[PDB]
Design a binder for these strands. Structure first.
Lengths: 155, 147, 94, 120, 255, 127
RNA sequence: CGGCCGCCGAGACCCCGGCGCACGGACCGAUUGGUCCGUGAUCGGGUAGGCGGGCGUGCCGGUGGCGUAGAAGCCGGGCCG
RNA sequence: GGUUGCACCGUCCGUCUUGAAACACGGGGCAGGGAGUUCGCGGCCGUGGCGAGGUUAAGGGGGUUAAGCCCCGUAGCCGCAGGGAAACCGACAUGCCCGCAGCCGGGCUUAUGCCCGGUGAGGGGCGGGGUGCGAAAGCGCCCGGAGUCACGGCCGCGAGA
């Protein structure tokens, strides 16, 4: 199915306990940490609430590859590179990405990588501002593939 | 061992020193009246109390016995006697009649109650017996003699 | 790790050597008796079951530790002036 | 320790012996015997000898993390190992049971944790 | 376990069986509770004067003059009563004669504590920590023949120790360990020696009339032995020198 | 040899230093004491407790040192206070350095220094 | 006012090293405690208050030390926490 | 390290307070003194001895320079059966079923570890029981042996507290 990357721009401050907790349920706590969520109606729903607090949108395979590589890690100093993915399971990092993209497997299944990626600020900063939605030209909410830009600046 | 000042501290310099607002530490008013005061109060005072069942009601009703009219008795279960039988060596043992052991309860002077089982035949002499105590002694193959 | 015998007393009345260890452990665990035990057997050239190690302390993270052992001629005599508690802790029996 | 934890040296040392056993032989039971000791004083066993008689058939190894307390029949061939016994308890167990033995000699009986039942 | 009995020529003769008490588990925690208990019992009360602050009347100096409403005295403005802030004022919570001074410890518990301190002596590790330096290592604790008790002269009991190799411990006890730090010395308990061996006898009264002389040496019989003597300040492992009848009567442990 | 990790932390300690954490404003009143003495600003009112800037830092645990490095003298070594010749014994000259107590006389001090240098233990004083 | 582009600009967030806490694992002790390793993105503001560890003061006891070739105390400096 | 210039930031302290830099209250400065204490009683907690019992108090023998400790006294208190105002009566050292820990068995991963079946002290849920009310029924309270004493401290109340 479609996979989305969700990042929380807005802090814990001024959040409802229901939204703030939803974000924790998204496996998103803090600022600038990003998550992989599948599109299911039940799954979709959390982000719908979250919308004001968060930026979401469906990512490209290429951009996804750059994020898994630098940022990803369950634990340990060790980075998630081709070799490390390879011992996990599957042939290589490319296949592993194609499989995530298909939604055939997940990070968890493959254990020793986390559902949360601690991502970077976007350089050149938040993409429009925390004030307003994607339509309004601000960073928040569902985005296009143009999410690529926000996360690349994030790494 | 805990130094109270060590907790009070010069520490906490709370200075309130585990009391709260400064205004609070004072006289009888924090307490709600002295002692048991306020239990009785119809008015708010203590009603409810630092008692679990709260406070039980007032009017001790019912009457007094003269101390004289109370015979004391001293109750002992058959279970106690039965377990102790070997320890009871001082008290006679008669295999032939009397059950296995002849025990005058009266070494501990008492009324004998029924709880427990009886592993041996006993001939028990006592001031009083319950009917449950009678059935178990007889079932064991023993007998009960009333003084 | 590395252990050196720092200070030596000898009581020949009861026929042992008594020894003090100054242990150097550099980012590695506070030593069990056993790890000291195999290394000590190599220095002394005496059996492991005769050589009885007791009392250890452990400083503030600086990498010196102290401990004591006693090395015995005869194996009746690790049970004349030395009680149950040490011996069981070594694992000599069982 | 900070709240619950033996001040008695003999008791604290026995717990440390217990840990080594758990590791070296790889059985779970001794560590269970450590957690029961670890409890507070009014949570450690108070075992009656007619409670011993009533539970678990002959020739099994009873481990008690408290005291065995006599007065009561005990017609079972069970062997009791325990942290303390009454004077009275020691006699019932040593006349009917497999034996009365200390818990620091329980190593010598059973160091591996086969056939054991914890009882309290 | 047997321990050699020794003649008074400082040589062994025979070996005799050791009583139960000496096997008993080492338990400093029990001894500590016991030692504490004996000390508090031999404390003499302490107070402060109870009529003070009634000899100083105290009157209130009012308001309207930009000072506190806290009481002074009539004519001088000085120290008063019903104050803790003032010079001369009450202390706040003076010592009472109702102050704690006993700590019970069960008769069962005390005997077990006694057993625990005697057992500690058999051990080498406690014995060197306690500070006794022993030249006669396999002889922990040392039992000597019955003749020793009858000796009650300082010169005679002295000689015998040098031959046994246990005079060396007294040499330790000579070193001063009670010229204390602190002003409290003045009142008493200064310029005094330190502890050394404990001698247990069976007979020749409740003490030996020549062995109270020797430095750090405290004498007792088995019908008076207490934790304080056996392991003072909660430090057991204090060397003992036993008498054959004393070991026998202790065998019979009772309470 | 001695370690790299220990150097790493020793350099951190030098570099890092510490502020002062002498008690809140102290210059202002001479009463407010003498050149040691932190006490935490217990006051509500406080700017230093409010943690407004410029009102010095108040202590937090965050400020500490690496354990391995805490208590290390400025040449890297480990202090042992030494009263006498006997105290010198079991002192690792490579790891530890001795400080002869101020209390100690020239009469003991001559014996202490001369034996401590034969053990290879760095001393300090004289003579 | 309606668009847009490049920048500036927090203790946030990322990143190296360190520190405490919590939890697991191991070891050490005669008790309390300590140490070594691992995990923590989802541990680290703080008044009332609750808890937990350390420090200091006076004297007592045991133990083990120091002092006229210079104690305590006082004043300035050096080092550690 | 002293002092000072320069950059940057900073409207005391404590207390009252919803809000204190305050035109709210208190303080010249410094030194010293200065505030969670004792007994009884109850409710907790940790720890220790002993054990269905447990502990002595009062005391006098004894020992000691004195004294503590030692051993001796066991009165009394609480616990060991409860219910009922009282009269007065008087109970499960186990019949049934779950199941934590552990033990036992099979399968599985390189290992720890895991999934599933017995056995299950401790624990949980029934039944039958005691007694009181009761024509009766139905509830109330109780029922298959753990407590006592000791030590420190938290907390309540009475005491100036």
């Amino acid at each position: 199915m479609a996979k989305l990357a969700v990042i929380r721009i807005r802090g814990r401050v001024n959040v409802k306990r229901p939204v703030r907790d939803t974000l924790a349920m998204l496996r998103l706590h803090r600022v600038n940490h990003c998550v992989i969520v599948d599109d299911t109606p039940s799954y979709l729903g959390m982000l719908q609430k979250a919308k004001d607090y968060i930026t979401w949108g469906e990512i490209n395979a290429e951009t996804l590859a750059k994020l898994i590589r630098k940022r990803g890690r369950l634990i340990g100093n060790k980075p998630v590179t081709d070799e490390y993915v390879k011992e996990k399971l599957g042939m290589t990092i490319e296949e592993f990405a194609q499989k995530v993209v298909n939604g055939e497997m997940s990070l968890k299944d493959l254990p020793n990588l986390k559902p949360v990626f601690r991502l970077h600020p976007p350089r050149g900063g938040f993409r429009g501002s925390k004030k307003r939605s994607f339509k309004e030209g601000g960073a928040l909410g569902y985005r296009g593939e143009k999410i690529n830009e926000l996360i690349e600046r994030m790494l | 061992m805990i130094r109270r000042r060590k907790k009070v501290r010069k520490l906490r310099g709370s200075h309130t020193h585990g009391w709260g607002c400064k205004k609070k530490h004072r006289g009888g008013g924090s307490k709600g009246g002295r002692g048991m005061a306020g239990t009785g109060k119809r008015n708010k005072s203590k009603w409810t109390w630092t008692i679990k069942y709260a406070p039980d009601h007032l009017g001790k009703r019912g009457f007094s016995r003269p101390p004289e009219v109370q015979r004391e008795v001293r109750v002992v279960n058959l279970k106690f006697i039965d377990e102790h039988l070997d320890e009871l060596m001082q008290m006679g043992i008669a295999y032939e009649e009397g059950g296995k052991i002849i025990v005058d309860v009266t070494q501990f002077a008492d009324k004998v109650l029924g709880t427990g089982k009886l592993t041996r035949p006993l001939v028990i002499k006592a001031r009083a017996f319950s009917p449950k105590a009678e059935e178990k002694i007889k079932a064991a193959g023993g007998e009960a003699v009333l003084v | 790790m590395e252990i050196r015998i720092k200070e030596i007393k000898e009581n020949k009345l009861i026929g042992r050597k008594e020894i003090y260890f100054e242990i150097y452990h550099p980012g590695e665990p506070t030593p069990s008796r056993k790890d000291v035990k195999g290394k000590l057997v190599a220095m002394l050239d005496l059996n492991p079951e005769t050589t009885v190690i007791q009392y250890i302390r452990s400083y503030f993270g600086s990498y010196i530790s102290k401990g004591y052992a006693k090395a015995y001629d005869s194996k009746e005599r690790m049970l004349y002036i030395e009680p149950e508690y040490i011996l069981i802790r070594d694992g000599l029996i069982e | 320790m900070k709240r619950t934890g033996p001040t008695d040296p003999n008791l604290r040392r026995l717990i440390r012996y217990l840990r080594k056993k758990s590791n070296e032989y790889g059985v779970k039971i001794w560590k269970d015997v450590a957690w029961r000791l670890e409890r507070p004083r009014r949570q450690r066993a108070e075992v009656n000898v007619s409670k011993i008689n009533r539970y678990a058939n002959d020739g099994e190894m009873i481990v008690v993390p408290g005291s065995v307390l006599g007065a009561g029949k005990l017609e079972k061939k069970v062997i009791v190992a325990a942290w303390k016994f009454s004077e009275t308890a020691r006699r019932k167990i040593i006349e009917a049971g497999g034996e009365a033995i200390t818990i620091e000699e329980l190593i010598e009986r059973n160091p591996t944790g086969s056939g054991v039942r914890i009882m309290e | 376990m047997k321990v050699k009995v020794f003649d008074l020529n400082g040589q062994p003769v025979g070996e005799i069986e050791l009583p139960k008490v000496f096997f008993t588990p080492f338990r400093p925690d029990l001894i500590r509770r016991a030692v504490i208990a004996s000390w508090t019992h031999r404390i003499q009360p302490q107070g402060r004067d109870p009529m003070a602050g009634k000899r100083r009347v105290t009157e209130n100096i009012g308001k309207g003059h930009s000072m506190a409403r806290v009481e002074r005295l009539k004519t001088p403005p000085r120290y008063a009563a019903f104050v803790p802030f003032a010079r001369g004022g009450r202390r706040t919570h003076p010592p009472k004669v109702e102050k704690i001074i006993w700590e019970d410890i069960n008769k069962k518990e005390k005997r077990l504590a006694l057993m625990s301190a005697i057992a500690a002596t058999a051990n080498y590790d406690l014995v060197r920590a306690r500070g006794h330096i022993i030249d006669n290592v396999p002889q922990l604790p040392l039992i000597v023949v019955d003749d020793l008790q009858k000796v009650q002269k300082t010169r005679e009991t002295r000689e015998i120790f040098k031959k046994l190799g246990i005079w060396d411990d007294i040499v330790r006890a000579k070193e001063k360990s009670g010229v204390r730090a602190g002003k409290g010395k003045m009142r008493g308990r200064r310029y005094k020696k330190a502890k050394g061996p404990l001698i247990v006898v069976g007979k020749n009264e409740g003490i030996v009339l020549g062995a109270r002389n020797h430095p750090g040496v405290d004498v007792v019989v088995v019908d008076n032995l207490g934790v304080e003597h056996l392991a003072p300040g909660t430090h057991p492992g204090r060397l003992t020198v036993w008498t054959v009848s004393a070991i026998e009567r202790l065998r019979e442990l009772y309470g | 040899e001695k370690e790299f990790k220990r150097l790493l932390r020793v350099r951190a300690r030098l570099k890092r230093k510490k502020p002062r954490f002498l008690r809140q404003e102290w210059w202002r009143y001479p009463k407010f004491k003498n050149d040691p003495k932190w006490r935490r600003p217990k006051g509500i009112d406080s700017k230093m407790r409010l943690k407004l800037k410029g009102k010095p830092r108040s202590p937090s645990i965050g400020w500490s040192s690496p354990k391995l490095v805490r208590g290390l003298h400025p040449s890297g070594y480990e202090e042992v206070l030494v009263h006498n010749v006997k105290e010198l014994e079991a002192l690792d000259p490579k790891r530890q350095a001795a400080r002869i107590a101020h209390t100690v006389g020239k009469k003991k001090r001559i014996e202490i220094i001369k034996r401590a240098e034969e053990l290879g233990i760095k001393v300090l004083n004289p003579r």
